[PDB]
Curated annotation (Swiss-Prot), chain B:
Organism: Saccharomyces cerevisiae (strain ATCC 204508 / S288c) (Baker's yeast)
Other known facts: Present with 33100 molecules/cell in log phase SD medium.
Identification of the protein by name: U3 small nucleolar RNA-associated protein 5
Location in the cell: Nucleus, Nucleolus
Function: Involved in nucleolar processing of pre-18S ribosomal RNA. Required for optimal pre-ribosomal RNA transcription by RNA polymerase I together with a subset of U3 proteins required for transcription (t-UTPs).
Swiss-Prot record, chain C:
Cellular component GO terms, alphabetical: 90S preribosome; nucleolus; nucleoplasm; Pwp2p-containing subcomplex of 90S preribosome; small-subunit processome
Keyword set, alphabetical order: Nucleus, Phosphoprotein, Repeat, Ribonucleoprotein, Ribosome biogenesis, rRNA processing, WD repeat
Name of the featured protein: U3 small nucleolar RNA-associated protein 18
Membership in a protein family: Belongs to the WD repeat UTP18 family.
Lineage: Eukaryota, Fungi, Dikarya, Ascomycota, Saccharomycotina
Full-length numbering of the shown residues: 239 to 594 of 594
Organism: Saccharomyces cerevisiae (strain ATCC 204508 / S288c)
Name of the gene: UTP18
The protein's assembly and partners: Interacts with snoRNA U3. Interacts with MPP10, UTP21 and UTP25. Component of the ribosomal small subunit (SSU) processome composed of at least 40 protein subunits and snoRNA U3.
The keyword Phosphoprotein is annotated on this UniProt entry: yes
Task performed by this protein: Involved in nucleolar processing of pre-18S ribosomal RNA and ribosome assembly.
Swiss-Prot record, chain D:
Gene field: NAN1
Keyword list, A-Z: Nucleus, Repeat, Ribonucleoprotein, Ribosome biogenesis, rRNA processing, Transcription, WD repeat
Any one of the GO BP annotations: positive regulation of transcription by RNA polymerase I
Classification lineage: Eukaryota, Fungi, Dikarya, Ascomycota, Saccharomycotina
Keyword rRNA processing: yes
Function of the protein: Involved in nucleolar processing of pre-18S ribosomal RNA. Required for optimal pre-ribosomal RNA transcription by RNA polymerase I together with a subset of U3 proteins required for transcription (t-UTPs).
Protein name: NET1-associated nuclear protein 1
Other notes: Present with 6560 molecules/cell in log phase SD medium.
Broad class of where this protein is predominantly found: nucleus
Subunit structure: Interacts with snoRNA U3. Interacts with MPP10. Component of the ribosomal small subunit (SSU) processome composed of at least 40 protein subunits and snoRNA U3. In the absence of snoRNA3, forms a complex with other t-UTPs. This complex can associate with pre-18S ribosomal RNAs.
Coiled coil: none
Compartments reported by the entry: Nucleus, Nucleolus
GO terms for cellular component: 90S preribosome; nucleolus; nucleoplasm; peroxisome; rDNA heterochromatin; small-subunit processome; t-UTP complex
Protein's organism: Saccharomyces cerevisiae (strain ATCC 204508 / S288c) (Baker's yeast)
Shown segment, full-protein numbering: 9 to 200 of 896
GO MF annotations in UniProt: mRNA binding; RNA binding; U3 snoRNA binding
Swiss-Prot record, chain E:
Leftover remarks: Present with 358 molecules/cell in log phase SD medium.
Name of this chain's protein: U3 small nucleolar RNA-associated protein 15
Species: Saccharomyces cerevisiae (strain ATCC 204508 / S288c)
Subunit structure: Interacts with snoRNA U3. Interacts with MPP10. Component of the ribosomal small subunit (SSU) processome composed of at least 40 protein subunits and snoRNA U3. In the absence of snoRNA3, forms a complex with other t-UTPs. This complex can associate with pre-18S ribosomal RNAs.
Localization: Nucleus, Nucleolus
Top-level taxonomy: Eukaryota, Fungi, Dikarya, Ascomycota, Saccharomycotina
Primary location class: nucleus
One Gene Ontology CC term in the entry: nucleoplasm
Source species, domain of life: Eukaryota
Record gene name: UTP15
Ranges: WD repeats: 36-77, 78-117, 123-161, 165-205, 209-246, 249-293
Length: 486, 475, 349, 184, 493
RNA sequence: AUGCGAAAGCAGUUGAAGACAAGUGCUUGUCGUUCGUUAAAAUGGCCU
């Protein structure tokens, strides 16, 4: 029982437990009427009005394991409806930010604590955040570019939030989990939701592509595997609900994760196609059959590699011809017509394969000329009109192991007109590293030699994207959305 | 209209209007130039407001009642400040005021002069052959306010200092209802029911002109120094005559006409507008007694105008907290699959006594029954011989037919498997010769993909099942 | 001139009420609509016209709050399981009350309700309650501005009707009493300040099938109070039955006699008494049937004598289904089956 | 050429710094129940309840004093722990808000009003211990405060009145409890 | 709050040859009726105007059938020899029948008594006799005289305009919709002729080379012609004077051809043909004349006709067969005191200010398993899923949902042996498929994990485990062979 | 359950102090207690 409150005369009791239901007891006849699906657990509840017009309560959203993300609520009590809902952005990070405690419950599971587990977990989390230099907090965040709306992919859900008006506009459940037909209590709390990992839009804006994985329940025969599902959603420019149009079960065979999704540029199919890249080497190109009404395969490239690498990337030229598939240690240049190596008839040392000293975390092309690669220790800017590296930069003290293999792409991004922006984060140490962090923001040019602009922010920065009116949006651990603009 | 008697202030910022409410009249002041639920109720259910006036430093209004009294009503406090009484019990048929002197026409022709700043009745008054009267105005000769004008279908210019008529103009047929001094030499007069307005000249005693409206006249107002005239007509309208006293030209028509039409096509009636130097103030009733207003530029709108107001005719109840339909703004949309196309990622697409002659015939055609009979043939030597005798394009289409039949009827994948086995044995040359073998033999590849992926869990289940079976069989 | 003249109706007028302070009538019928008219004598114009969807109306009442007086509501109800509450200039705010907290097996239809005040009596904060008929003897009582469930009373036999009386006590305190009448003629009187506890029972003389009871002559749910000091105690209690008979009691003797004899027993009408309505003062009692045309009679009190010169045989009454006295101006409003309300003004008031 | 600004804010700033659960909510519905007031992590939003719309917003970065109270970028120790609706100094001048920060700071601001560069500032003495809660009946004010000497805290109850001098807030030791666990 | 999400069914990735919407419509065409006539049936015509009737030829017999009751309404049998073509007018009233003695007889439908006009044509048998489409006083008939004559039925003594220039056995002709003067005529040596009647008309304006003997010709559009002859059929453009498609998807000679347009259908235009094998196949001219459906009648099928575009009743598809068999296949189709008392129901709010609506769109009924899983009774949910006559997809979605929520062992705790047996029966069945095999793997894994002791104790479950062992071994054998064949394909790449 | 790692896996982890309860100065268990490490219960289930 997490929240309790009394009415004013003292005849009704309000009870606020884990199962997301707010229960009103008549005390005399011991009776109850209750509101059963409340978008999270009821941390706190009370009455407000001098007659009892409104019930105001505080919800947790207990699924968000990386960060506690509250939601205030004010209910009109006659209709039992929601006269007000108050919220901010709800990002899911990769690890628990500074000194967060999960709520208390009857057992110790992966959404809550016991009592003893609460105390010990508090101390252990603080000590681990002090000690380990593994720590990263990098959140996926997408942007609807024909409405400029931030899409924070929650676990098994999407919070559509805009930054102008600074308020949530939608919450949608994008997975067939156990998301709402129950309030999870103990071993339901042991179970968990299928997680959305990747979320992209086409450049046209009218197609959303979501990749999620789903985990089976524990202690069963088929608990070892996962199931990875791709989904394609549409909407018209007047509604606020995405209709599922195509569900693709198990891309690239059984239990094979698609560790990069890339939409298509405009010129190829009016930006109505996507590329899926595994951790093995396979690249698939899906597109929209329009005499049908669906998405299907239209070009495969499936090699069988006995080596798995968790960090891939890829990039696409603006014409729709050159594709740079950067697998670990090696970038391959492919023609889209053949999905094979672009072998030069002239052979002017424009070799189809590049081998880079560290593992690739990012490939980008700022124009049809300059290719930027962010490698596991360093950063290399190369030209394509002459096959030689232009510029180099050392990042090995800055990013040693403080990011997982595959998150520097969401760290560093580029404007398609002026330049790119670097992001470096270090935590301020005193004599041992302390809690607080410090993140510097550097803006290079297309040649990457001259730094266009240097700035510094105090709190850790988890994600930089570029706003399509040539500026840059960045999120923060404490969710303060900022902009680097003209 | 439910608005019995209404009148603007000077300078056009607040209108008084007296209207009836469960058979008790209330007066109310509303502001216009940019609600007020204050009112004054007449406590008696019989006395009515007979005439109305605004008076200037503290603003007030003056209410000539039915009873025989003339109330003086402040606005800020809803309180009758002082109730003058003519020493009689009649109906004050008209009230008027200039400066501090106040003059009222009683029901029995008795003129009364009151003083405001003295709170007194100065003089009772009556003259000869002014026997029925219902309108009074006072000419602005300055602060010397002599030679007032009275009327009831015969306008008479009466002096005070000698108590006699000087000039008498021919009026109307019906009684007059509007009598307003336009300039220091002219005045306009309009009866009750006539569409005509007579512009008379005082000293000559003549009719300079007549102005003819389009329906029966109800309310008149004029600009500063005789430039324009707004007419509230009985149908609901507004008729400005631009420059009325200029240069047959005996009768003049209305220059500019204004109506008010809402979105739904209905016709909202205007009452009691007010004009000034290039600013026209129009009023109407939105709900049954609540007056709404508008300001508009009559020197710039065209000759015929229809104000377009947004009146809620057949509103759909857009609640602010509900959605457009059903849910509220705090819930969460469910995950509904619907008629989405569920596919896999292994669906390659968009990238001797034989029967060989009847098979090749069926597959040049496309015959379920004939192909079903040939497939119901069983003997493996006959199968080998038929596929040995067949043609490669026929073999490819045979492979597709066999694979789709397998994928539907998975029970039929023994004999159809030996069929596809012998086909891939024999005709392999054309198969290695055709380029896009995946796009050709799509469904075969997908069906074998499903089954070969199914295998390992079956191995595990058989392992555990055999363990339990031998456990209960050993003892 | 008919209040329903400027904008007619399409079913019978089931509910008329005057707003307690402002000049306004509210009519509702089976056309699922609610029409509010600004009433004069001359031109009775349409202020507003709401139209619910798929929900009829049998009972619509105005209700202004007592401690607040800047809070008006309109409560509407038909034979469904919800009760709409319109709050009171471009789009309405209509809550609905649809859940009884637990006690849902009693009433399957919200259609017979009354609206009264109640004092918390620990705090002196008055609030509006909504009384509903129920299954067998059940009267359910819900706190209005929050829709909560306060208290329930059970009379035996079948409830046929109920009514609300007040009693002042001192400076700033009153207490409210609920009267409920069986079909046999047995009358229960509970009080609501302390919980549902029967103050008294008695029996009406005769009264074989009793279909309506009304209290009148003080403050009641038709000519209602506007501040706590202006609450009075009712004097007359009239009980109208199915056969046409209207017994009529003085409370100042009935409460002391505890199985009383009526002051009078009126028998002018001959069909089922389907409307009783006292004046705001209590000097006229309007009794009106529903089963036949031209079936309204006014009664002078304490004479308990039917007025003889109105209605005459050429009075356009119709099948009278609604009667509403005016609180202030002395009007009477009668609505019939054809959907035409009709005003009269009494010249005494 | 390039400017770095902060445009939007998030988290709703719960009363978790106590962790004793006094009252986790600190939002306060206004007097005439038309406006709702939530103190965010970097601003104070004033929503309007008849139309679900944020009307006035009170950011911390615009006025300098709030930038000196909350925006000390070395430590976010100071946080809003209570919001009171009236004026604590004068009786009923309306559209004013007093805000009680975790460490003895009290500010009088004016929602629905143009924010001038003079919010009425007050500092409470004796707060070597940290503030926990501030509440009031008519006229009289009381403060729960958290102090120490078994990893628990002492709750000191103080009585607050005003106006011995202008800046002076009169504080008296009403009572004290030693090792609290829960408190409502 | 929010609403309760309904349980989503389990839609597997789709297997090839799913059911297409064209297949849905043309399989709704059902309720076959077979009528054995006297001899073969040549031609079948529909009344255009009120399409409720259709004539069918025979040997010395024309029969008017009805669309409402599918019974023969009228018989024209005043013929002395084999009647060839019975075609209605384009206006409804008057039908013409070309005989084989050499004359045509034109008289009104719904009156076999009154022979209205008898045009003596050439002494060779007249096969095809049509009325015009735009005009309605000009008939055109061909013969074995290898000439087609245009008669004007006011002046029925002389052909108003003869039409020659063919070679051998003119047996098909067709007018063209937009041009009311241009006649296409399909001969029997191929060589479809195109005449313009306001010219001389002795010579064709231009010819078309359908190299097989053309069996029918239809102006499918104002600019396109379709030609039925030999094995294939070929559709030609008119103005550019070139064939456009050639579909040879048949076995024997295609015989009859019909075309319907802008009707109640997922397929806008339907071009159907009939091809002497029972095979009647239906194509669409928007996806380049690909087959969308096909029926098989046993005997050699001669004529076919689908009901016209304005039928508005039960639509028909008629096929006449050389065995003498007509085959019809049809897509089918208080008191006033009280009302005055309560007359306000049907109002719907037409003249009111604000219209509010609140009532709920009533959802479909929840099944018993969905009620049980919504009310948390897991064991009752499992038993109610394993009630006998349910759907495979539904039992699969129950087990999928219950496993996804986690209540596998919780649902399986209290089960006694006689209650294990229904689960094990459906498990024994559903081991054979693929998706059901994965879910039965999970559930029988936990059943064997639980109940080994009562498995030893009771003998019925022992025999059930024997059957399960045999079938799982058989399934392993199946998947082994399938993996082998996939290896064979990967070799043969 | 921590680190590295691919959806596999590969290495490693379960230490004391204090306090209290029960049973017999001794045994177990407990923690709204400290420091060191990379570390199932109270017959109780979702409104209209």
């Amino acid at each position: 029982v997490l929240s309790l409150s009394f009415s004013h005369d003292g005849s009704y009791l309000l009870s606020g437990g884990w199962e997301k239901v707010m229960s009103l007891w008549q005390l005399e006849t011991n009776s109850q009427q209750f509101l059963p699906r409340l978008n999270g657990i009821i941390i706190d509840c009370q009455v407000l009005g001098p007659q009892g017009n409104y019930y105001s309560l505080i919800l947790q959203m207990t699924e968000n394991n990386s960060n506690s993300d509250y939601q205030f609520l004010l209910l009109n009590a006659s209709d039992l409806t929601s006269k007000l809902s108050i919220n901010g952005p709800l990002p899911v990070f990769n690890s628990t930010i500074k000194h967060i405690q999960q709520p208390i419950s009857a057992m110790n599971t992966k959404n809550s604590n016991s009592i003893t587990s609460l105390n010990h977990s508090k101390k252990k989390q603080s000590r681990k955040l002090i000690k380990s230099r593994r720590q990263d907090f990098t959140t996926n965040v997408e942007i609807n570019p024909i409405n400029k709306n931030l899409y924070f992919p929650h676990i098994s859900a999407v919070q559509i939030f805009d930054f102008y008006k600074n308020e949530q506009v939608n919450y949608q459940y994008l997975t067939s989990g156990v998301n709402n037909s129950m309030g999870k209590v103990r071993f339901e709390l042991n179970l968990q939701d299928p997680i959305i990992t990747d979320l992209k839009f086409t450049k046209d804006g009218q197609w959303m592509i979501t990749y999620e994985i789903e985990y089976p329940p524990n202690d069963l025969l088929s608990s070892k595997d996962l199931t990875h599902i791709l989904k394609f959603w549409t909407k018209n420019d007047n509604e606020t609900n995405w209709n599922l149009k195509t569900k693709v079960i198990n891309p690239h065979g059984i239990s094979v994760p698609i560790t990069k999704i890339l939409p298509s540029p405009r010129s190829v199919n009016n930006s109505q196609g996507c590329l899926t890249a595994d951790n093995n080497g396979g690249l698939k190109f899906w597109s929209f059959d329009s005499h049908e009404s669906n998405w299907c395969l239209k070009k495969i490239s499936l090699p069988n590699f006995n080596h798995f690498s968790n960090s891939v990337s890829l990039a696409w030229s603006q014409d729709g011809s050159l594709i740079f598939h950067g697998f670990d240690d090696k970038l391959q240049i492919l023609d889209f017509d053949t999905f094979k190596k672009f072998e030069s008839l002239e052979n002017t040392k424009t070799v189809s394969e590049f081998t880079l000293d560290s593992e690739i975390q990012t490939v980008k092309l700022i124009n049809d000329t300059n290719l930027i690669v962010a490698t596991r220790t360093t950063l290399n800017a190369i030209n394509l009109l002459r096959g030689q590296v232009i510029n180099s930069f050392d990042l090995y003290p800055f990013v040693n192991g403080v990011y997982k293999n595959g998150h520097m792409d969401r760290l560093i991004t580029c404007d398609e007109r002026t330049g790119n922006i670097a992001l470096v984060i270090n935590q301020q140490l005193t004599d041992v590293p302390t809690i607080n962090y410090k993140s510097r923001i550097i803006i290079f040019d297309s040649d990457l030699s001259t730094k266009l602009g240097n700035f510094t922010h105090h709190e850790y920065i988890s994600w930089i994207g570029w706003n399509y009116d040539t500026d840059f949006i960045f999120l923060d651990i404490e969710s303060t959305l900022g902009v680097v603009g003209t | 209209s439910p608005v019995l008697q209404s009148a603007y202030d000077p300078s056009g910022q607040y209108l008084c209007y007296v209207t009836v409410a469960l058979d008790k009249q209330r007066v109310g002041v509303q502001p216009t130039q940019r609600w007020n639920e204050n009112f004054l109720y007449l406590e008696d259910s019989k006395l009515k407001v007979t005439c109305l006036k605004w008076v200037n430093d503290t603003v007030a209004i003056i209410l000539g009642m039915n009873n025989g009294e003339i109330w003086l009503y402040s606005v800020l406090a809803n309180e009758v400040t002082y109730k003058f009484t003519t020493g009689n019990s009649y109906e004050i048929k008209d009230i008027d005021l200039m400066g501090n002197q106040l003059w009222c026409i009683d029901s029995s022709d008795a003129f009364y002069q009151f003083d405001l700043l003295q709170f007194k009745l100065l003089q009772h008054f009556r003259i000869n052959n002014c026997v029925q009267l219902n309108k009074l105005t006072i000419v602005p000769a300055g602060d010397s306010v002599a030679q007032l004008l009275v009327a009831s279908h015969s306008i008479s210019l009466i002096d005070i200092e000698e108590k006699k008529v000087v000039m008498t103009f021919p009026g109307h047929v019906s009684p007059v209802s509007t009598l307003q001094v336009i300039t220091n030499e002219f005045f306009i007069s309009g009866a009750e029911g006539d569409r005509f307005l007579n512009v008379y000249d005082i000293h000559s005693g003549m009719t300079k002109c007549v102005l003819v409206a389009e329906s029966d006249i109800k309310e008149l107002s004029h600009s500063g120094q005789a430039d324009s005239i707004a007419v509230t007509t009985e149908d609901g309208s507004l008729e400005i005559f631009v420059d009325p006293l200029v240069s047959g030209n005996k009768s003049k028509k209305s220059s500019k006409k204004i109506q008010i039409v809402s979105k739904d096509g209905r016709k909202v009636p205007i009452y009691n507008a007010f004009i000034n130097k290039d600013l026209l103030n129009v009023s109407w009733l939105q709900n049954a007694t609540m007056p709404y207003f508008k300001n508009l530029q009559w020197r710039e709108i065209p000759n015929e105008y229809t104000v377009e107001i947004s009146l809620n005719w057949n509103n759909k109840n857009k609640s602010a907290d509900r959605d457009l339909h059903g849910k509220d703004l705090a819930s969460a949309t469910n995950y509904v699959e619907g008629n989405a196309r569920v596919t896999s990622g292994d669906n390659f697409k968009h990238v001797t006594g034989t029967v060989t002659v009847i098979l090749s015939q069926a597959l040049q055609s496309n015959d379920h029954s004939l192909l079903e009979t040939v497939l119901n043939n069983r003997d493996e030597r006959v199968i080998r011989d038929t596929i040995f005798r067949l043609k490669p394009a026929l073999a490819v289409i045979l492979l597709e037919r066999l694979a789709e039949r397998i994928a539907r009827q998975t029970h039929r994948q023994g004999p159809l498997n030996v069929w596809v086995k012998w086909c891939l044995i024999i005709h392999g040359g054309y198969l290695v010769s055709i380029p896009n073998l995946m796009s050709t033999l799509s469904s075969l590849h997908s069906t074998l993909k499903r089954r070969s992926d199914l295998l390992p869990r079956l191995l595990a289940l058989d392992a555990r099942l055999d363990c339990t079976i031998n456990k209960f069989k050993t003892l | 001139k008919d209040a329903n003249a400027s904008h007619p109706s399409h079913s019978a007028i089931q509910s008329l009420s005057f707003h307690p302070s402002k000049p306004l009538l509210l009519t509702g019928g089976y056309d699922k609509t609610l029409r509010i008219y600004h009433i004069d004598g001359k031109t009775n114009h349409l202020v507003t016209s709401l139209h619910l969807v798929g929900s009829p109306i049998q009972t619509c009442t105005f209700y202004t709050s007592l401690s607040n007086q800047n809070q008006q509501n309109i409560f509407t109800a038909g034979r469904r399981r919800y009760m709409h509450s319109w709050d009171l200039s471009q789009t309405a705010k209509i809550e609905k009350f649809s859940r009884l907290y637990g006690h849902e097996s009693t009433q399957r239809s919200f259609e017979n309700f009354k609206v009264a005040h109640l004092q918390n009596s620990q705090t002196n904060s008055v609030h509006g309650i909504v009384l509903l008929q129920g299954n067998n003897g059940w009267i359910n009582i819900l706190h209005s501005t929050s829709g909560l469930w306060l208290m329930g009373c059970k009379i035996e036999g079948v409830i046929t009707d109920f009514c609300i009386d007040y009693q002042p006590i001192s400076r700033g305190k009153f207490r409210t009493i609920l009267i409920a009448v069986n079909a046999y003629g047995e009358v229960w009187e509970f009080d609501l300040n302390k919980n549902g506890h029967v103050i008294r029972r008695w029996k009406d003389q005769g009264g074989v099938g009793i279909t309506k009871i009304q209290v009148g002559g003080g403050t009641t749910t038709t000519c209602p109070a506007l501040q706590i000091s202006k609450i009075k105690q009712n004097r007359w209690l009239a009980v109208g039955s199915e056969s046409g008979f209207v017994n009529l009691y003085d409370r100042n003797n009935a409460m002391t006699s505890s199985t009383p004899t009526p002051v009078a027993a009126l028998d002018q009408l001959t069909t089922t008494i389907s409307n009783l309505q006292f004046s705001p003062d209590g000097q006229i009692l309007c009794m009106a049937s529903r089963a036949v045309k031209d079936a309204l009679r006014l009664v002078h009190l304490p004479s308990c004598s039917v007025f003889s010169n109105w209605p005459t045989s050429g009075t356009p009454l119709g099948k009278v289904t609604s009667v509403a006295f005016s609180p202030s101006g002395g009007l009477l409003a009668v609505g019939n089956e054809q959907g035409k309300v009709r005003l009269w003004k009494l010249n005494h008031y | 050429q390039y400017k770095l600004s902060v445009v939007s804010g998030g988290k709703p700033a719960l009363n978790n710094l106590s962790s004793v659960t006094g009252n986790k909510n600190i939002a306060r519905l206004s007097q005439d129940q038309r406006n709702y007031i939530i103190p965010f992590n970097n601003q104070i939003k004033v929503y309007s309840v008849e139309t679900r719309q944020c009307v006035k917003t009170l950011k911390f970065a615009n006025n300098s004093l709030l930038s000196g109270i909350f925006l000390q970028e070395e430590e976010n120790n100071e946080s809003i722990v209570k919001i009171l609706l009236g004026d604590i100094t004068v009786p009923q001048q309306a559209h004013l808000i007093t805000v009680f920060t975790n460490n003895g700071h009290v500010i009088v601001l004016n929602y629905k009003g143009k924010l001038v560069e003079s919010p009425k500032h007050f500092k409470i003495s004796l707060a070597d211990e940290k503030l926990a809660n501030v509440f009031h009946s008519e006229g009289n004010y009381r403060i729960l405060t958290t102090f120490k000497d078994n990893s628990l805290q002492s709750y000191r109850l103080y009585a607050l009145t005003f106006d011995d001098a202008k800046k002076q807030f009169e504080v008296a030791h009403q009572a004290e409890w030693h090792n609290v666990i829960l408190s409502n | 709050s929010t609403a309760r999400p309904r349980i989503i069914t389990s839609k597997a990735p789709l297997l090839p040859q799913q059911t297409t919407p064209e297949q849905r419509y043309w399989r709704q065409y059902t309720s076959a009726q077979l009528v054995k006539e006297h001899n073969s049936v040549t031609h079948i015509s529909f009344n255009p105007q009120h399409p409720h009737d259709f004539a069918v030829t025979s040997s010395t017999r024309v029969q008017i059938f009805s669309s409402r009751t599918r019974q023969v309404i009228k018989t024209f049998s005043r013929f002395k020899d084999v009647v060839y073509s019975a075609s209605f007018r384009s206006d409804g009233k008057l039908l013409c029948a070309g005989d084989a003695t050499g004359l045509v007889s034109v008289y009104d439908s719904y009156n076999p008594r009154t022979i209205l006009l008898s045009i003596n044509a050439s002494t060779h048998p007249t096969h095809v006799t049509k009325f015009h489409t735009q005009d309605n006083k000009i008939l055109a008939t061909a013969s074995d005289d290898r000439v087609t004559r245009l008669w004007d039925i006011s002046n029925a003594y002389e052909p108003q305009l003869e039409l020659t220039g063919a070679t051998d056995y003119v047996r098909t002709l067709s007018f063209i919709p937009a041009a009311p003067h241009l006649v296409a005529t399909g001969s029997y040596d191929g060589l479809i002729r195109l005449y313009d009647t306001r010219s001389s008309g002795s010579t064709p304006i231009y010819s078309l080379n359908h190299d097989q003997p053309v069996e029918n010709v239809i102006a499918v559009s104002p600019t396109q012609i379709v030609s039925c002859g030999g094995n294939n059929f070929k559709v030609w453009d008119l103005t550019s004077n070139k064939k456009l498609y050639e579909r040879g998807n048949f076995n024997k000679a295609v015989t009859c051809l019909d075309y319907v347009e802008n009707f109640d259908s997922p397929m806008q235009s339907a071009l159907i043909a009939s091809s002497l094998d029972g095979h009647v196949k239906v194509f669409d001219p928007l996806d380049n004349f690909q087959v969308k459906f096909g029926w098989k009648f046993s005997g050699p099928v001669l004529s076919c006709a689908v009901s016209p575009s304005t039928a508005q009743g039960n639509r028909h598809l008629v096929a006449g067969l050389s065995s003498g068999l007509l085959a019809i296949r049809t897509k089918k189709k208080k008191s006033n005191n009280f009302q005055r008392m309560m007359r306000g129901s049907e109002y719907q709010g037409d003249q009111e200010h604000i219209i509010h609506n609140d009532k709920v769109r009533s959802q479909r009924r929840m099944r018993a398993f969905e009620r049980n899983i919504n009310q948390f009774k897991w064991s009752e949910a499992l038993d109610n899923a394993f009630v006998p006559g349910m759907a495979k997809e539904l039992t699969l979605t129950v087990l999928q949902e219950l496993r996804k929520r986690g209540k596998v062992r919780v649902a399986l705790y209290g089960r006694d042996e006689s209650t294990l047996e229904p689960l094990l029966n459906w498990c024994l069945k559903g081991i054979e498929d693929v998706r059901s095999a994965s879910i039965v793997a999970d559930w029988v894994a936990v059943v064997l994990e639980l109940y080994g002791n009562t498995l030893e104790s009771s003998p019925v479950l022992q025999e059930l485990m024997i059957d399960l062992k045999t079938k799982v071994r058989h399934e392993i054998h199946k998947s082994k062979e399938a993996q082998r064949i996939e290896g064979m394909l990967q070799l043969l790449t």
